Amino acid sequence: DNQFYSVEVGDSTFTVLKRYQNLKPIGSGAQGIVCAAYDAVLDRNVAIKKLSRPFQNQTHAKRAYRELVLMKCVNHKNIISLLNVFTPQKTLEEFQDVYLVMELMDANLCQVIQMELDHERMSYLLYQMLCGIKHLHSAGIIHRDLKPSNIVVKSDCTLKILDFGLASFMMTPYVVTRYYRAPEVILGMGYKENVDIWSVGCIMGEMVRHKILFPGRDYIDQWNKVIEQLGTPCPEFMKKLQPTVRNYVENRPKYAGLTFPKLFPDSLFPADSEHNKLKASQARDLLSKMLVIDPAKRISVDDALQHPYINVWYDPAEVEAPPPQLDEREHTIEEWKELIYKEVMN
Ligand SMILES: CN(c1nccc(-c2cnc3ccccn23)n1)C1CCCCC1
């Protein structure tokens, strides 16, 4: 008569509540494996993520605690909803894993990118991406690490964001994606709201070109790709770089920089229609404003939402929603356990 049960999913063991049946591994990230499942109580499918020993290290603990907290207080339509949280362990001493049960989407953005999208769907997706980033910002949150994988969508094309970004040693087997990070992040410069716009621009560009814009083994290569395409940033920008960094970027082989109609030609945009020819120019325009190295010259979230390519989905009921301690600390794996544990069970 145990409230839980166990099943082997892939390699790890998922121990979940009885209400959740027929588990199917729908994915795997860095902080856990995610299975889809049916919730006999709510009569619907859901996604369950297992946080195995989230307190094993500050990187994982900080991430877990933070996500657990913000996912319970924040409430938006474009930010994955938290249905239920639980732990098969009965006490703080036995405590080991944390199961996050959420609503089940249909696919990853990485999958959507691998396909041609009409201006209607491409713009609607970008609108939701910005609609949410809008809320996250109003909630005092600035992602700074948005990427295709952390964004999920349904078939009806509705879009939702999974995590809340950063706030860092990781002795693990798998890498981290840096392709969609902003220059101020790649070079460390201090950021602001529009630091996420850079990520959105990296995605929109990939939704079109169908290939990762600025790929790279290290930030060395990544920054190279940034200039090889956009060109070397104006001298007004370099005087904001750390003297040690400035000395590195300035003394780097220059570039004139390709124009946008070059980077994103019409071959990538479906402009067989008089209506498509227009939207294609508009899309190419929002891109030329989002993919701007200089933060001071980059388009804000609010402007990108007033852009003719996006505004065609506006609605004061969606974007305009009411926003809600200081979870940016430093403890030990035994404290983090206590913190996370008590957070799990209110
Ligand atoms: C870390 N993973 C993850 N974490 C939290 C939630 C979800 C999630 C929620 N609904 C769906 C539907 C399909 C695939 C994944 N999901 N996935 C990965 C993210 C990148 C794509 C594969 C799973």
CA-wise closest residue to 328 among 208, 157, 166, 137: 166
Residue nearest to atom 23 of ligand 1 (CA): 27
Residue nearest to atom 20 of ligand 1 (CA): 149
The torsion angle over the Cα atoms of residues 130, 135, 138 and 142, rounded to 10 degrees, is -60
Please report, for residues 160, 191, 219, 233, the alpha-carbon distance to residue 179 in angstroms, rounded to integers and kept in the order given.
20, 17, 9, 18
Contact (Cβ atoms closer than 8 angstroms) between residue 68 and residue 343: yes
Q: CB-hemisphere CA count at 13 Å for 147?
A: 16
Select which of 145, 285, 294, 302 is catalytic: 145
**SS3 (DSSP) at 21:** strand
Is 32 annotated as ligand-binding? yes
What are the structure tokens assigned to 318, written together? 């969606």
Q: Residue 51 pairs with which residues in a beta bridge?
A: 98
Q: Residue 160 pairs with which residues in a beta bridge?
A: 152
CA 295 from centre of chain: 19
Atom of ligand 1 nearest to the CA of 80: 9
Cite the residue boundaries of each domain of the chain with CATH code 1.10.510.10.
107-321
Compute the distance between CA of residue 171 and CA of residue 138 in angstroms, rounded to an integer: 34
Compute the distance between CA of residue 205 and CA of residue 263 in angstroms, rounded to an integer: 9
- Ligand 1 centroid to residue 36 C-alpha, Å: 9
Count of residues in the chain: 346
Cite the residue boundaries of each domain of the chain with CATH code 3.30.200.20.
4-106
Method: X-ray
Q: How do 97-103 and 82-86 pair as beta strands?
A: antiparallel
Residue nearest to atom 16 of ligand 1 (CA): 105
What are the structure tokens assigned to 39, written together? 């919730």
Radius of gyration of the chain (CA): 22
Residue with tokens 């920054």: 223
Please report, for residues 264, 276, 334, the alpha-carbon distance to residue 210 in angstroms, rounded to integers and kept in the order given.
11, 19, 45
Residue nearest to atom 11 of ligand 1 (CA): 105
DSSP 295: G
Atom of ligand 1 nearest to the CA of 104: 10
CA-wise closest residue to 223 among 272, 167, 179: 179
- Would you say the CB of residue 162 lies under 6 angstroms from ligand 1? yes
**SS3 (DSSP) at 161:** strand
Cβ-Cβ contacts under 8 Å for 82 (sequence gap 6 or more): 71, 72, 100, 101, 102
- Ligand 1 centroid to residue 217 C-alpha, Å: 25
Is 216 annotated as ligand-binding? no
- Ligand 1 centroid to residue 100 C-alpha, Å: 11
Arch. (CATH architecture) of 4-106: 2-Layer Sandwich (3.30)
Instruction: Tell me the best of 38, 79, 108, 203 to mutate to test the pocket of ligand 1, counting ligand atoms within 8 Å of each CB and taking the most.
Output: 108
Q: Which CATH fold would you assign to the domain 107-321?
A: Transferase(Phosphotransferase); domain 1 (1.10.510)
145 noted as active-site residue? yes
Sign of CA dihedral 227, 233, 235, 241: negative
What are the structure tokens assigned to 40, written together? 């006999």
